[PDB]
Ligand binder design. Structure first.
Ligand code: HEM
Ligand code: EH1
Ligand code: CL
Length: 393
């Protein structure tokens, strides 16, 4: 009843061009079985949305990667938020929500915007830049570590640790094994920066530790919740902003619309998240036998959600393969959906908005002028190098 496919969604060929195989996954049926890894897959918007919004049946405490924490040891102690279910999930989630609150955004927005304008001004002086290293990476590295309260020394561990975290969600292929092989120095740095004395006053890290006396979290929970932000808070925005610049570089018509109305910056970034879906995949584990799309999935089965495919499903979207900065993007699953929906999305959207605003006001053209190189990761989709010439407005 359930179609079996040999597609490996974690193969380099798949990463290089996932869209044909993602259509094959969608059109094979609402639920597929991936013989390569012995997991169920759902690639249509409807089933992805349904799974995300049934956390009781499709739990996260057994891991949101391929590995089932009930069968294998997690590569690191489980996250108190991402890898927890209600009710254990609820209070750690509330703390991170209050830490990354609208009030916090108001306190940091002006500095985030000034740094975005400064970076674009700097880049325009060079003209020919690499939109990854020099922008998508450089800008978040210029605001997020400081907003965390991190010291200067050791920040070079942040992106490697994030690449490790996101490769570790995948199956035990070479990408994952190599990441874990090299993990020790990055884990050691990150774990140490999670301790309260190492997080500067007023930043996100210190705010988490200050929240340890309300009865929501205890002091021994704060370090791992800092770990959550050092895991998820940087590499995601790098690939989000990279996605948006890549979109504007490829669709000059949309850059021209953005220039004509910079208030479209926030939705242009939201559309980029839908269009590229920097986070491609997430797993759940069934806690019971469950019917999904006519298939009977047993208990303790891994279910792979194709967020990027759901965000290009023509059953949900009109012209899903077009980048449209005035599209009504509400409902895309690029940030997830339901109780685990990205708790840091206000930070993500703030960075993306102020960067696209800087580009909208200061840049007239973005032309690819060198070889584009893709970056391969079991969970993240993005580029390694994006040579562009920036023409000033
Ligand atoms: C474009 C940027 C980002 C994208 C595309 C993204 C994507 C996602 C997605 C899809 C989830 C759901 C995971 C699941 O359902 O299992 C998630 C959760 C999460 N994200 Fe984001 N994220 C981004 C930025 C950020 C930032 C900036 C932070 C922190 C500053 C952050 C922290 C988290 C955390 C802690 C969770 C777990 C929330 C929970 O389990 O309740 N993310 N993210
Ligand atoms: O350590 C954590 O708590 C943690 C780590 C990684 C993530 C990812 C964010 C982007 C979507 C996939 C999951 C979320 C939380
Ligand atoms: Cl770790």
């Amino acid at each position: 009843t359930i179609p079996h496919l040999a597609i490996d969604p974690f193969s380099l060929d798949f990463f290089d061009d996932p869209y044909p195989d993602q259509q094959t996954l969608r059109d094979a049926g609402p639920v597929v079985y991936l013989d390569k890894w012995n997991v169920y897959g759902v690639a249509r918007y409807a089933e992805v949305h349904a799974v995300l919004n049934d956390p009781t049946t499709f739990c996260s405490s057994r891991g949101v990667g391929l590995s089932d924490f009930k069968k294998e040891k997690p590569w690191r102690p489980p996250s108190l938020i991402l890898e927890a279910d209600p009710p254990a999930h609820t209070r750690p989630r509330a703390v991170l929500s209050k830490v990354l609150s609208p009030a916090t955004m108001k306190t940091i927005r002006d500095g985030f915007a000034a740094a975005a304008d400064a970076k674009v001004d700097e880049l325009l002086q060079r003209g020919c830049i690499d939109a990854i290293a020099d922008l998508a990476e450089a800008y978040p590295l210029s605001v997020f570590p400081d907003a965390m309260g991190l010291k200067q020394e050791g920040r070079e561990h942040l992106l490697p640790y994030a690449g490790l975290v996101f490769n570790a969600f995948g199956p035990p292929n070479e990408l994952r094994q190599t990441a874990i092989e090299r993990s020790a120095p990055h884990q050691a740095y990150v774990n140490e920066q999670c301790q309260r004395p190492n997080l500067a006053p007023g930043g996100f890290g210190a705010c988490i530790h200050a929240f340890t006396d309300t009865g929501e979290i205890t002091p021994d929970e704060a370090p791992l919740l800092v770990r959550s932000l050092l895991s998820a808070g940087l590499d995601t925005t790098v690939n989000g902003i990279g996605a948006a610049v890549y979109c504007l570089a490829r669709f000059p018509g949309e850059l021209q619309r953005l220039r004509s109305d910079p208030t479209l910056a926030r939705n242009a970034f939201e559309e980029a998240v839908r269009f590229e879906s920097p986070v491609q995949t997430v797993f759940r584990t069934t806690t019971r036998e469950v019917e999904l799309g006519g298939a009977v999935i047993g208990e303790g089965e891994k279910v792979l959600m194709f967020l990027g495919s759901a965000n290009r499903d023509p059953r949900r979207w009109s012209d899903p393969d077009l980048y449209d900065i005035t599209r009504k993007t509400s409902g895309h699953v690029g940030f997830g959906s339901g109780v685990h929906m990205c708790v840091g999305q206000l930070v993500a959207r703030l960075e993306g908005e102020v960067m696209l605003s800087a580009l909208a006001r200061k840049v007239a053209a973005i032309d690819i002028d060198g070889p584009v190189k893709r970056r391969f990761n079991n969970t993240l989709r993005g580029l390694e190098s994006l040579p562009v010439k920036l023409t000033p407005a």
